[PDB]
């Protein structure tokens, strides 16, 4: 019922997060041509044996994800309060949420026109088929696409988008966290900002239980995270796979 106005601090938090995102997410994807080139082998049959023997799209996608992890680290460092955490806790949070924030931020390039992550010409258009060419299976891809569509349909304001990523990163329920109380205090400040923003700036009927739906996406992400982890493990068993990855990727997912 009540719709309190955003406090000055809350307005500041949102401005800071919008700015952090604009500085770490290039909507033109102009750096992508610097990654190792994408290669698409003929795999109309979706052969696991062939996909693993080649891993043709892995070098490019690994570079894309490595690049993205670097951007997420930069984004996180700008989250109000993040710097108040110990170095040890900052790293724990980053490593555990990296893949989830990547899935979230990727929703910006995802398009329902053809269910792909379109980052430019045909060369930089990523489809389910490209993900399989990188060693992953439908067990991850299927729910990932469903997740992207579900997120797209929430029609989030950029303010809600950046707050969701911040809330995802600053989670007290990550294994290995030291000061969970502090992390939770920081997360609550962000969650309260999101709830307040939704209540006084998000017009209906898109505001109906929007917060609950957003929180459910965070739960969905935990599942996707676990499935990606299991599959990455399997992928890492392929001889010479490390050379197709990057040191940052090896560390975060290793
Ligand atoms: C990265 C970003 C973008 C798209 C995200 C995608 C499309 C390609 C496949 C990805 C990268 C998917 C998200 C997860 C999925 C995954 C399952 C991860 C996996 C990585 C590994 C092999 C190491 O296991 C390869 O496929 C583009 C832009 O919006 C920026 C955003 O930052």
Curated annotation (Swiss-Prot):
One of the record's GO molecular function terms: RNA polymerase II cis-regulatory region sequence-specific DNA binding
Keywords attached to this entry: Cytoplasm, Disease variant, DNA-binding, Metal-binding, Nucleus, Receptor, Transcription, Transcription regulation, Ubl conjugation, Zinc, Zinc-finger
PTM per Swiss-Prot/TrEMBL: Ubiquitinated by UBR5, leading to its degradation: UBR5 specifically recognizes and binds ligand-bound VDR when it is not associated with coactivators (NCOAs). In presence of NCOAs, the UBR5-degron is not accessible, preventing its ubiquitination and degradation.
Annotated region (Interaction with coactivator LXXLL motif), positions in chain: 77-95
Domain NR LBD stretches: 9-254
Variant or mutagenesis effect after changing residue 136 to Q: In VDDR2A; loss of calcitriol receptor activity; no effect on interaction with RXRA; changed interaction with NCOR1; loss of interaction with NCOA1; no effect on sequence-specific DNA-binding
Residue ranges that the Swiss-Prot or TrEMBL entry lists as coiled coil: none
UniProt-listed GO biological process terms: apoptotic process involved in mammary gland involution; calcium ion transport; cell differentiation; cell morphogenesis; decidualization; intestinal absorption; intracellular calcium ion homeostasis; intracellular receptor signaling pathway
Domain of life of the source: Eukaryota
Assigned protein family: Belongs to the nuclear hormone receptor family. NR1 subfamily.
Comment on protein domains: Composed of three domains: a modulating N-terminal domain, a DNA-binding domain and a C-terminal ligand-binding domain. The 9aaTAD motif is a transactivation domain present in a large number of yeast and animal transcription factors.
Disease: Rickets vitamin D-dependent 2A: A disorder of vitamin D metabolism resulting in severe rickets, hypocalcemia and secondary hyperparathyroidism. Most patients have total alopecia in addition to rickets.
Function: Nuclear receptor for calcitriol, the active form of vitamin D3 which mediates the action of this vitamin on cells. Enters the nucleus upon vitamin D3 binding where it forms heterodimers with the retinoid X receptor/RXR. The VDR-RXR heterodimers bind to specific response elements on DNA and activate the transcription of vitamin D3-responsive target genes. Plays a central role in calcium homeostasis. Also functions as a receptor for the secondary bile acid lithocholic acid (LCA) and its metabolites.
Full protein name: Vitamin D3 receptor
Name of the gene encoding the protein in the UniProt record: VDR
From-to range in the entire protein, with total length: 119 to 423 of 427
């Amino acid at each position: 019922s009540l719709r309190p106005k955003l406090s000055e601090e809350q307005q500041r938090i949102i401005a800071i997060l919008l700015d952090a995102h604009h500085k770490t997410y290039d909507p033109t994807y102009s750096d992508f041509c610097q990654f190792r080139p994408p290669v698409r082998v003929n795999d109309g049959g979706g052969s696991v044996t062939l996909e693993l023997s080649q891993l043709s799209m892995l070098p490019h996608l690994a570079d894309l994800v490595s690049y993205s992890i670097q951007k997420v680290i930069g984004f996180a460092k700008m989250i109000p309060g993040f710097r108040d955490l110990t170095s040890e806790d900052q790293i724990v949070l980053l490593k555990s949420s990296a893949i989830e924030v990547i899935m979230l931020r990727s929703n910006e390039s995802f398009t329902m026109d053809d269910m792909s992550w379109t980052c430019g010409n045909q060369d930089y258009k990523y489809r389910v088929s490209d993900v399989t060419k990188a060693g992953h299976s439908l067990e991850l891809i299927e729910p990932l696409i469903k997740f992207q569509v579900g997120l797209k349909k929430l029609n989030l304001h950029e303010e809600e988008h950046v707050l969701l990523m911040a809330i995802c990163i600053v989670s007290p329920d990550r294994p290995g966290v030291q000061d969970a109380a502090l992390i939770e205090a920081i997360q609550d400040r962000l969650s309260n900002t999101l709830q307040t923003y939704i209540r006084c700036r998000h017009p209906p009927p898109g505001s109906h239980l929007l917060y609950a739906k957003m929180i459910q996406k965070l739960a969905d992400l935990r599942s996707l995270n676990e499935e990606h982890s299991k599959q990455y493990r399997c992928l890492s068993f392929q001889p010479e796979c490390s050379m197709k990855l990057t040191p940052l990727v090896l560390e975060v997912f290793g």
